[PDB]
UniProtKB/TrEMBL annotation, chains O, P, Q, R, S, T, U, V, W, X, Y, Z, AA, AB:
It comes from the Bacteria. It is a single-pass type II membrane protein. InterPro entries: Antenna_a/b, Antenna_beta_dom_sf, LHB-1/5, Light-harvesting_complex. Keywords: Antenna complex, Bacteriochlorophyll, Calcium, Cell membrane, Chlorophyll, Chromophore, Light-harvesting polypeptide, Magnesium, Membrane, Metal-binding, Transmembrane, Transmembrane helix. Ca(2+) binds at residue 41. A bacteriochlorophyll binds at residues 14, 32. Belongs to the antenna complex beta subunit family. Residues 8-42 form the Antenna complex alpha/beta subunit domain. One of its GO terms (cellular component) is plasma membrane. This is Beta subunit of light-harvesting 1 complex. The chain crosses the membrane at residues 16-38. Gene3D superfamilies: 1.20.5.250.
Amino acid sequence: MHKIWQIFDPRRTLVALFGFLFVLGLLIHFILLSSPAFNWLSG
Amino acid sequence: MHKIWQIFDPRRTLVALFGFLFVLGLLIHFILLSSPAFNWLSG
Amino acid sequence: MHKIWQIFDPRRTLVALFGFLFVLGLLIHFILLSSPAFNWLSG
Amino acid sequence: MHKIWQIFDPRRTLVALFGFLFVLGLLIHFILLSSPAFNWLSG
Amino acid sequence: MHKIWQIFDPRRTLVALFGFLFVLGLLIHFILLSSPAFNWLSG
Amino acid sequence: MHKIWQIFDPRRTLVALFGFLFVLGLLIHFILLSSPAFNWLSG
Amino acid sequence: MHKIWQIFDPRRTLVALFGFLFVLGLLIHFILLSSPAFNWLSG
Amino acid sequence: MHKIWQIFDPRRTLVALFGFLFVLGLLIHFILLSSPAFNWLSG
Amino acid sequence: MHKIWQIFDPRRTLVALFGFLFVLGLLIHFILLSSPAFNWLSG
Amino acid sequence: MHKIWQIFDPRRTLVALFGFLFVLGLLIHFILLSSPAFNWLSG
Amino acid sequence: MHKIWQIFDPRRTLVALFGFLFVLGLLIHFILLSSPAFNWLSG
Amino acid sequence: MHKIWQIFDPRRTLVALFGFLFVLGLLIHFILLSSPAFNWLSG
Amino acid sequence: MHKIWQIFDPRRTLVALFGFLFVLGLLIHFILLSSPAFNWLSG
Amino acid sequence: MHKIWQIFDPRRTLVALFGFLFVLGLLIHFILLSSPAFNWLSG
Amino acid sequence: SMTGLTEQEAQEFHGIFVQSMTAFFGIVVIAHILAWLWRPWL
Amino acid sequence: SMTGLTEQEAQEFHGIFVQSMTAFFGIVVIAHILAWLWRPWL
Amino acid sequence: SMTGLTEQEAQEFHGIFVQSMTAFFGIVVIAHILAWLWRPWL
Amino acid sequence: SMTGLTEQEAQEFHGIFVQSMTAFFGIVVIAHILAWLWRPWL
Amino acid sequence: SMTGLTEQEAQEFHGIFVQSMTAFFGIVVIAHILAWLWRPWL
Amino acid sequence: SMTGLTEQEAQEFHGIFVQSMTAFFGIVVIAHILAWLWRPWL
Amino acid sequence: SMTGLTEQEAQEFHGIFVQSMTAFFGIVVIAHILAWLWRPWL
Amino acid sequence: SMTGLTEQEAQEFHGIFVQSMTAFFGIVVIAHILAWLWRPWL
Amino acid sequence: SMTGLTEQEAQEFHGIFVQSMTAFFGIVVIAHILAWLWRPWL
Amino acid sequence: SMTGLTEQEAQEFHGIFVQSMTAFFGIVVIAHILAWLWRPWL
Amino acid sequence: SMTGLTEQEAQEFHGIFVQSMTAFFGIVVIAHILAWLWRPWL
Amino acid sequence: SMTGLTEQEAQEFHGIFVQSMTAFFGIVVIAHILAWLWRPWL
Amino acid sequence: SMTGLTEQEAQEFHGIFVQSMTAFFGIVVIAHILAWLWRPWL
Amino acid sequence: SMTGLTEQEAQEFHGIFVQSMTAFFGIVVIAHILAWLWRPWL
Ligand code: BCL
Ligand code: BCL
Ligand code: BCL
Ligand code: BCL
Ligand code: BCL
Ligand code: BCL
Ligand code: BCL
Ligand code: BCL
Ligand code: BCL
Ligand SMILES: COC(C)(C)C\C=C/C(C)=C/C=C/C(C)=C/C=C/C(C)=C/C=C/C=C(C)/C=C/C=C(C)/C=C/C=C(C)/C=C/CC(C)(C)OC
């Protein structure tokens, strides 16, 4: 399974993964803010 | 059936597949959020 | 009938066919969601 | 009548024909969906 | 009258002619759909 | 009067003439459709 | 007065003249259609 | 006074003059159409 | 005072002067038309 | 004070100065037209 | 774990990290200002 | 203090200064016109 | 800690730092002006 | 502290400083004009 | 003469072009007769 | 003279052009007569 | 003539093209008979 | 003199230009007379 | 002939293509039968 | 002097230019007299 | 054959691809069973 | 000096320029006198 | 094989990648347990 | 010094520039006096 | 290995990076404790 | 030093610049005194 | 090491940078104390 | 160092820069005192 690094660049795979993870966290936090039942900043 | 990897580049097929799967999962999760019967963040 | 593959590029055909089939599936699923009689996510 | 293939390229002609036929089928199906008397997805 | 083929390219003439004929057919069919007296998809 | 063909190209002239004639016919037909007294598709 | 053809190209002048005359005729016919007193396609 | 033709090109000047005269005539005719007291196409 | 013609091109200057004078005359005639007290085409 | 003409181009300065003076005169005349107390074209 | 500095440029990584941290702090401070319960500049 | 002319071009500086001063005067005059208490063109 | 200056340029870093500090000060001052409780220019 | 001039160009730094100072003065003056309590051109 | 076709290639293309256009016009005429029996427009 | 056609090619093109234009104008005249009998506009 | 296909490569392509188009048209005809049985439009 | 035509090619073009323009103006005059008999505008 | 594949590479690709298309169509047919048992649309 | 025309070519163009402009202005004057008899604007 | 992979590199990639896809599909199936236990949609 | 005109070509252009500008200003003055006779604005 | 890393560099990167991803997933799991004790969503 | 003019071309341009500016300012002053007699703004 | 840093330069950078990040996180933790004592959000 | 002007050309430009700026500021001060006499703003 | 500065130029820049940043932070702290005595926000 | 100025050109510019900035700040302070006597904002 390590052979994926012979196919994918350790750096661009890693930068892209970090960027997508950050955008995903932002999106999930924003979605929970848009839901009144899970908005923790109201109250 | 393995001969597909002699026609399709493994890295570009993996990148495109992963991106399409991520966008598909985002789309399905967003469609269920727009569905009042299947929105799990209301209540 | 196999001679079409001496006319059509296998990889570009396969990529285009898969993309059009995916877009067709998305379109049909979205059309059925827009029809109240066939929306399975309401109820 | 076969001489048209000495004038028309088989691959570009055939790709254009398939694309136009697909778009025509999509258009005809969308028109019948816009007509209440022939919309099969309501009811 | 055949000498028009020494002036007009047999293939760009048939491609343009076929495209214009298809667009004309689409236009005439759409104009009859927009006319209530000649819309065949209502009723 | 034939000398015009030594000034104007038999093909480009002819293509332009056919195009303007087609657009003129389209325009006149659309104008008669926009006039209630001469719309033949109403009734 | 003929020497204008040694200043102005017979063909480009002639194409421009024909185009301007056609556009002028279209403009005058459209102005008369926009005037109720001279619209001949009403009634 | 003829020396202006040694300063100005007889053809570019002449084309520009004809174009400006045509645009001026169009403008003056349009202005008289926009004035009800001088619109000759109403009545 | 003639030495301005050794600084300014007799033709580019002259074309610019004629164009600016024409635009100025158009502007003044349009301003007087926009003033009801000085519109000569109403009445 | 004449040495400014060894810094500033006599012709480009004159062109710019004339253009700015013309635009300034236009602006001042338009401002006085927009002021009812100083509009000379009303009445 | 230090080997990441042989994959990721110590400077571009560091600039990107500082920029993302600054934008994240701005975003969090703006979200709390938009939340009435945690807006500290009101009252 | 004269050494600034060895750092700043006597002419590009001077043109920029004149332009900014003109724009500043225009701005201040327009601001005083927008203020009813200091508009001198009303009355 | 000084070795950061062997990674980051004394001048570009410093220009960016000054620019972001100025924009941050402007932003904080504008936010306090948008807050009625901390607007010092009202009253 | 003078060594900043071996890092920052005396003229481009000075031009930028003057421009930012002018824009800052304009901004502060406009902000005080938009505040009724500190508008000096009303009354 | 202008495109590259000879007088025999142009004559060969013209015959097939005219036959195809005649077939197209015959189908069009049959469709128009059917449409007139369906809904006359004049 | 200006495009490349000789006068024999221009005269032989002019005849076909005039014949085609005359056929077109005759068809237009018949159509306009039919339109006038259908709905006069003057 | 213009593309590169000979008369044998064009006749080989034409036969398969006509067979495929005939199969497509047969499926189309069956579908349209079914559609008329479902909802006639004329 | 400026575009390349001689005095004989320009006089040959000028005659045909004037004849065509005169025919155009005659047709225009007949049309305008018919329009005046139809709907006078002055 | 036009892309580069021989008749053995085109027949090897065609067999796998047809098998994959048949499997896809079988899954599609099962899904459509299930959909008809769920909600008939005709 | 600046474009390329000599004074004989400029005097030849100037004469025809002045004649054409005089004819244009005469037609304009006649039209404006007719317009004044139609609808005076002052 | 077309990209550069041999039949042994393609079989090496295909096995790992199929294992990863099977693990992904197993996780997906478990998630969908849990979703049906939570809120059935049919 | 800066464009290419000598002092004799500049004095030749300046005289005609001044004459043309004076004629233009005379026409303008007559028009403005007529306008003031028609509608004074002061 | 395709990027440039050998199997020893890929196994060295894979181990650290898996350790970092496992730590990230452990923190994520702890956070999700805390969120469930805070506000269950199912 | 910077644009190419000497002190004699710059003094010759400066004199005419100052004379023209003085004439312009005199005309402007007369116009502004007339405007003040027409409508004082202060 | 990929950027240019050796393992001594990377370990020199990693130590300072970890120290700076730890100081940043300590300041952040103190700020968050102060925020919780100010306005708890859970 | 940076643009090209020597110290004597910079002192020559500086004197005229300061004289012009002083004249401008004197006119500005007179205008602002007049404006204060017209409408004080403080 | 990376941008061009030696360790003596980087230590020379670091001292002045830290002194300037400390002065800036001290002025900021005094301003924030003044703001808190003017309008506390917590 | 990097722009091109020596320690003597940078010290020459720094002294004049500091003097000009001090004059600017003194004028600013006087203006702000006047503004506070006009309308205090705190
Ligand atoms: C308004 C009341 C009438 C009506 C009366 C009018 C009248 C009156 C006329 C038409 C004309 C036309 N009408 Mg109609 N028309 C009606 C309604 C329609 C409807 C419809 C769906 O209702 C259709 C599609 C048409 C279509 C047409 C075309 C057959 C024709 C214009 C073609 C053209 O522009 O060629 C011009 C472009 C070309 C390129 C022609 C070139 C000719 C050369 C020699 C041949 C080369 C082949 C060339 C590419 C195509 C030739 C086409 C034929 C010449 C038509 N009519 C109704 C019911 N119509 C006109 C006609 O008969 O023209 C022949 C005409 O005079
Ligand atoms: C309106 C009432 C009916 C209905 C009656 C009609 C009628 C009537 C017809 C269709 C036809 C079609 N309908 Mg329908 N249709 C309905 C609702 C649907 C719905 C839906 C969401 O409910 C969808 C997904 C479809 C889909 C389809 C396709 C199977 C087909 C059009 C394919 C095409 O354009 O090929 C054209 C494009 C090509 C590229 C074809 C090329 C053929 C060559 C030989 C093969 C090469 C492979 C090629 C790439 C793809 C081949 C696809 C098959 C030929 C279908 N129908 C309903 C309920 N429908 C038509 C059909 O049967 O066509 C075969 C047809 O005649
Ligand atoms: C409308 C009422 C029904 C429903 C009935 C229908 C019917 C009827 C069908 C589907 C079909 C599908 N439905 Mg559905 N479907 C419903 C709701 C859903 C929802 C949801 C959020 O609820 C999801 C995401 C899906 C998803 C899907 C996919 C599994 C499938 C379309 C795949 C495709 O386009 O391949 C096309 C694109 C490709 C690239 C295929 C290529 C195939 C080759 C041989 C394999 C190569 C791998 C390739 C890259 C991906 C293969 C994917 C699989 C073939 C699925 N359905 C509901 C509840 N749905 C269809 C299906 O079964 O297709 C297999 C089908 O016939
Ligand atoms: C407003 C009340 C009047 C009226 C009174 C006015 C008055 C008054 C005048 C016109 C003028 C014109 N009117 Mg009118 N006009 C009316 C309504 C019309 C209507 C309409 C739809 O009813 C149209 C089509 C016109 C059209 C015309 C043109 C014949 C002419 C402007 C030509 C031009 O600008 O050349 C300018 C451009 C050129 C290139 C001219 C160049 C001349 C050289 C010497 C010849 C070279 C050939 C050149 C390419 C074209 C020459 C055209 C002729 C000179 C006309 N009038 C009504 C009913 N009209 C004017 C005229 O007579 O001009 C001669 C004129 O003085
Ligand atoms: C407002 C009440 C009055 C009126 C009073 C005013 C007054 C007062 C004046 C005009 C002027 C003009 N008016 Mg007026 N005017 C009225 C309504 C009209 C209407 C209309 C539709 O009713 C028209 C089209 C005109 C037209 C004109 C032009 C003849 C002239 C501006 C030309 C110009 O800008 O040259 C400037 C541009 C040039 C290029 C000039 C260059 C000159 C050189 C030497 C010659 C080279 C040829 C050049 C290309 C064209 C020369 C044109 C002539 C100089 C006219 N007036 C009414 C009824 N009008 C002015 C005039 O007489 O100017 C001569 C003038 O003083
Ligand atoms: C919704 C109710 C809860 C809440 C419950 C959830 C749950 C449940 C989770 C979070 C997660 C996070 N929450 Mg939360 N969260 C809340 C409110 C907040 C608020 C706020 C303004 O109130 C903010 C600032 C955050 C911030 C965070 C981050 C610490 C973290 C997402 C980081 C990420 O996406 O890394 C992804 C991007 C990367 C680049 C990670 C890479 C990791 C590698 C190994 C390290 C390299 C350094 C890298 C650049 C940064 C690492 C960051 C850490 C891994 C966090 N939460 C509230 C009150 N939140 C998640 C978490 O714990 O992630 C660890 C998580 O599981
Ligand atoms: C507001 C109440 C008054 C009025 C009072 C004012 C006052 C007060 C003044 C004007 C000035 C002007 N007015 Mg006024 N004005 C009124 C209404 C008008 C109307 C109109 C439609 O009613 C017109 C078109 C004008 C037009 C003019 C111009 C004659 C002149 C501005 C020219 C300019 O900008 O040169 C600037 C641009 C240049 C290029 C000048 C360059 C000068 C050099 C030396 C000569 C080179 C030739 C150059 C290319 C053009 C020279 C033009 C002349 C200098 C005018 N006024 C009314 C009724 N007006 C001003 C003036 O007299 O300026 C001379 C002036 O002081
Ligand atoms: C608000 C109540 C007052 C009023 C009080 C104010 C006050 C107070 C002042 C002005 C000033 C000005 N006002 Mg004011 N002003 C009023 C209404 C007007 C109206 C109008 C339509 O009513 C006009 C057009 C003006 C016009 C002017 C200009 C003369 C001058 C700004 C010039 C400038 O920006 O140079 C800046 C740009 C330059 C390039 C200057 C450069 C100077 C060098 C030395 C010379 C080189 C020549 C250069 C290219 C042009 C020089 C122009 C002169 C210096 C004016 N005022 C009214 C009625 N106004 C100011 C002034 O006097 O400045 C001299 C001034 O202090
Ligand atoms: C909100 C209630 C208070 C108020 C309390 C706050 C508080 C609290 C603070 C400020 C700060 C500032 N306030 Mg405040 N402030 C108020 C209203 C104002 C108004 C106004 C129109 O009323 C003005 C124009 C200002 C302006 C300022 C600046 C003096 C300063 C931010 C400068 C900066 O961003 O440097 C950052 C950008 C740089 C480039 C600095 C670089 C420093 C280096 C060492 C020097 C190089 C020169 C550099 C180019 C410019 C240096 C500028 C000085 C450091 C200020 N305040 C009111 C009435 N304000 C802050 C401050 O004191 O900062 C010093 C601060 O802490
Ligand atoms: C090179 O030549 C050789 C040697 C080969 C010989 C061959 C020669 C040949 C073949 C020559 C052929 C010549 C031809 C065909 C000439 C045709 C000439 C034509 C038809 C001339 C027509 C002229 C018409 C003119 C100029 C009309 C002008 C109309 C105007 C300007 C109208 C203006 C209207 C205005 C501005 C305002 C009012 C209109 C409204 C009211 C609409 O505005 C709102």
